[PDB]
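ligand=32Q
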Amino acid sequence: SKTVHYLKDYQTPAYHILKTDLHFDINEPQTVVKSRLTVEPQRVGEPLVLDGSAKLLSVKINGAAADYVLEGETLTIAGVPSERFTVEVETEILPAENKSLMGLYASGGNLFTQCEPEGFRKITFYIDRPDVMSKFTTTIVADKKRYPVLLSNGNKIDGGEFSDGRHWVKWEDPFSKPSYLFALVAGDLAVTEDYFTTMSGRNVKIEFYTTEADKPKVGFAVESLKNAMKWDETRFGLEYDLDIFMVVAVGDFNMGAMENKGLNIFNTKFVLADSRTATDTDFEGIESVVGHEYFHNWTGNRVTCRDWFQLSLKEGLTVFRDQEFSGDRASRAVRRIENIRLLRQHQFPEDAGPTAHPVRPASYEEMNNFYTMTVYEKGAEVVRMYHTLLGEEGFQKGMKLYFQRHDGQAVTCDDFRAAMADANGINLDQFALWYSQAGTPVLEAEGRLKNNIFELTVKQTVPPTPDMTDKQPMMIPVKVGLLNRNGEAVAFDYQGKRATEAVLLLTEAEQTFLLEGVTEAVVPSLLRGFSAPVHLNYPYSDDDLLLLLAHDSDAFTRWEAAQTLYRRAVAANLATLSDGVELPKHEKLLAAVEKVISDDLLDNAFKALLLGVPSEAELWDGAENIDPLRYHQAREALLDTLAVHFLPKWHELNRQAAKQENQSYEYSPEAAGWRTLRNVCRAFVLRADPAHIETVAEKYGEMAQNMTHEWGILSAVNGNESDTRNRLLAQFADKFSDDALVMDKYFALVGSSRRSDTLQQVRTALQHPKFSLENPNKARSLIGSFSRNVPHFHAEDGSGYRFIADKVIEIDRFNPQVAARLVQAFNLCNKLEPHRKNLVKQALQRIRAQEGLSKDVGEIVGKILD
Ligand SMILES: NCc1ccc(C[C@@H](CP(=O)(O)[C@@H](N)CCc2ccccc2)C(=O)O)cc1
Ligand SMILES: NCc1ccc(C[C@H](CP(=O)(O)[C@@H](N)CCc2ccccc2)C(=O)O)cc1
Ligand SMILES: [Zn+2]
């Protein structure tokens, strides 16, 4: 009987912890942790149960050796006082042996922590659940020369020196917090200092800690933080609440970053950049993630989660906030489409697959398996629907009441929903289903103009998922407009208002919406701004789609029209390839693309999106008995056709873009848009004319004016069977051998190549001196990329499956989190054609047969196999 955790079983804790006093004595190799916990009975007389997995040296209750039992990862004391009492725990840790990167661990000769969700119990024995909030004071003692920088949450209130070369510090964090927000750093790190003055007039000292060599790359992150601090004030009315804000970069880290109170810890990938070594996308990522972690100070820290089932309470909302921040900075419509594309490419397959779950899960075995596209990105779409239904002003009324009610509390998704409802005086009961029902809703829509009424009928359905069969009608906002035969906006009457746009609120299984006062023939524009996270089916002709693409006023619906045209073209390719005949002409598609190419009024980055073809996973959505190589072949044929058909115009557009970039090689949204278009053109050019690689190689130094250009060119040639591709990659690795984030790029190119020899190049790269399997960035770059490399992962001989299964098994021995993400490469199992399905099931059974397989990987494998 494995342990499953159920949301229905939630009970308030028997004990609170009012004060948490910690002492870290850092030595070589061991660190000894001492605690003093001030414990307050809630249900008097129950046993005290503490979570913990660190080596236990001693435990006391009010200063006397406790009578306790340690079983598994729980410490229990039966005899506890009926009033306030203390518990003192002594544990010992070997951080350099901690390759899980959870708890207290070594990286680069320094010490770091990661406690979310349940890592604090790897440091000491504790009531390690987020509804237990305590006031932390942390003392740290270490060798001064080896560990001159000693940090923990909050305010530094004392410190000093010892005559043996050791020194110490004491940090007090005055805001009661759950254990998952604890952090400690001890190291030889360089500091970059700055400050921000809050709107109430208080300076906040900003400190970024990096390696000495990395310091010159942290400046954009600092600027981004100051931008995020100002934005939370101007957009949400939220001010920071300490006079110190620390950010620490670490090269070994499971995820992107972590919002520990006043002491955020970041993957280097999301804090370090310069134009020589980071792409524009990398800069955008730093801006997004620095914003994200700062926004958590209110949405996550000041108001936290009652239990881990409520994770989206903080993550969906903080993602919405980071999206809005980025959109307010620049390029809102393009960035919105990027977010939608990410959701459909990665979250929609999750909701269609064996690991599908609601935004608020009802159960889990291992909580680290639920830091998902669903909880984050669908979670953010759910928050955004409040904004769509209520408007910005109403949304901010909800936010204000949320903090009024729940500042200092650990609360639920329901509480956020109630604040939105109550602040605006409306009923959002049906909205709750966005949290409890998994799966992507499918809307079927039909339209007719009768009299002068456009009647839009819309049906909704939500498929069963493995957790739940019954799915009731949901509250689904559908933003619409109407175009006449010349693509002009057409007004209409709805709920006693004449406008060119309206939000139709679908709440029943099937409804008809009457758009009245329509005096011209129309084609509707539907789901504007991607107004709900759904699949929408409407009968559009190719000519309707061309109209929408050419003339609609909404970015998403224009882009979705192009996407539909590409999808239909791939489907036509599939049919001809299957019937063994000539490829289709795609005459209408090609006319549409020529128009996009030649339109000088189109925003550059938007034009780039209109020229992107949906991924293989998008293309086989909803299919059974999938042969991934047949979809790959149909998609590649389309790209080949686009590349060759328009080769001169790809060169021409590249030149236009280069001229407009105007040698402005530093990061800016404007220059970046031109580079994005430039890199689309390069990809098409080198597909049509692979020999152009020698021309690029001859002038490489001249083209390599920043990393966006180097990455764009290497990406464009990465599938080229020329030896020059291999030489350019080798030269790249040599040039940048000292920059670990650039080496990640090298390994991603190795892993992602559609060349025939990628598996053996990947196996050589495993032994590259700069590769480390125990580093998540490296493992994700090489092995993760390979697992997403459709022709290689899904090779008919099963070599891709065997390779990835081998690496899941190996990585799980030291980092179950990385292994459990990797093993989801197999999630398509039950939808594959029989030969591959058989091989994937063999691979999964072999993983399952491993002695000592983690709960993390076992939970995923069980969902796929069983
Ligand atoms: N309601 C329970 C609670 C609330 C707030 C706290 C927080 C503590 C924080 P603190 O003592 O370090 C205060 N001096 C910081 C003021 C400031 C703000 C912004 C910029 C610069 C300086 C408090 O402000 O008292 C602690 C507990
Ligand atoms: N624009 C979308 C977006 C999504 C997420 C982010 C940031 C996100 C980090 P996060 O703030 O959610 C953090 N609470 C994850 C916990 C964790 C950390 C390490 C190990 C286990 C658990 C990331 O990982 O990047 C930032 C932006
Ligand atoms: Zn987050």
